Amino acid sequence: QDSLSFGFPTFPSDQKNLIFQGDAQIKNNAVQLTKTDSNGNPVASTVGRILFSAQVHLWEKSSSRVANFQSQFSFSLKSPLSNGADGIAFFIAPPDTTIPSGSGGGLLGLFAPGTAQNTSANQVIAVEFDTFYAQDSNTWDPNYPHIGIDVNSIRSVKTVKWDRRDGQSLNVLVTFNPSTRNLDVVATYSDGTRYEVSYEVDVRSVLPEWVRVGFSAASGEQYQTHTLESWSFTSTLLYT
């Protein structure tokens, strides 16, 4: 289909079109990307992702068309620790994408350690909300919580300072305009605090024509819950 869209105002446990990977599972009408104990408390060493089952037609070689897509979603992180980790990410990858071996912790369940920074070894575009930046383990991160745009590497091609607010929902709008090739990210907290980051990227050179969209999150030694509360997505092929 040239156009596809779906909306999850909430996530009832009765799901049919979501591909759950790792520890990801539905709880309290929300997606708990990372594992939590019987008390709903976050635990260490956990990775989880969800993908919408239907493949998205990102671009079409034959018609020279590229998709105009928008992904609106909200999530919240919670942790009794002063340094909750590791972060959540909205990502776009090949349809057969699975959790890479050893992709936990700072790699957000998106990259394998050996090629995490090899842009030629990956095919993924992701908007990460990174809360752990310990300069000894996450050597690639700026020294502070941030929102980053990842293109075939865990080393964001771009980051903007971000504030982590325990238990507060962040509303995020990620849009891609094929005309300008601008990938825009706008995130806001309920008090009006706003964060914006944009990047020009030709998705045609990074991802295959058909892809799957979803979220990923992980916790290494430090942990926190990564709760996806809602998600709406829409894409439509346009001439360029």
Ligand X SMILES: CO[C@H]1O[C@H](CO)[C@@H](O)[C@H](O)[C@@H]1O[C@H]1O[C@H](CO)[C@@H](O)[C@H](O)[C@@H]1O
**Site residues (CB under 5 A) for Ca ion?**
106, 130, 132, 138, 141
Q: How far, in Å, CA of 118 to CA of 226, rounded?
A: 27
The structure tokens listed for 226 are 């990564």
Tell me the residue nearest to ligand X as measured from the CB: 104
Segment 141-180, which members bind Mn ion (CB under 5 A)? 141, 148
141 binds, among a copy of itself, ligand X, Ca ion, none (CB under 5 to 8 A by kind): Ca ion
19 versus 160: smaller Cβ distance to Mn ion = 160
Chosen residue from 41, 45, 60, 238 binding a copy of itself by CB under 8 A: 60
Please give the full DSSP string across 58-89, using - where no structure is assigned. Answer: -EETTTTEEEEEEEEEEEEEE-SSTT---EEE
178 binds, among ligand X, Ca ion, Mn ion, none (CB under 5 to 8 A by kind): none
CA dist list (Å): 180 to 55, 139, 160, 177: 24, 32, 21, 6
Q: Is 100 in the site for ligand X (CB under 6 A)?
A: no
138 versus 235: smaller Cβ distance to ligand X = 138
176: left (phi over 0), alpha (psi -120 to 50) or beta: beta
CA dist list (Å): 129 to 57, 67, 100: 25, 24, 19
90 versus 111: smaller Cβ distance to ligand X = 111
Task: Let me know: does 78 contact 227? Beta carbons within 8 Å.
Answer: yes
Phi, psi of 99 (to 5 degrees): -70, 115
Chosen residue from 27, 28, 40, 54 binding a copy of itself by CB under 8 A: 54
Chosen residue from 64, 119, 163, 210 binding a copy of itself by CB under 8 A: 210
Which parts of this chain interact with a copy of itself (CB under 8 A)? 1-9, 12, 14, 16-17, 52-55, 57, 60, 62, 95, 209-210, 232, 236
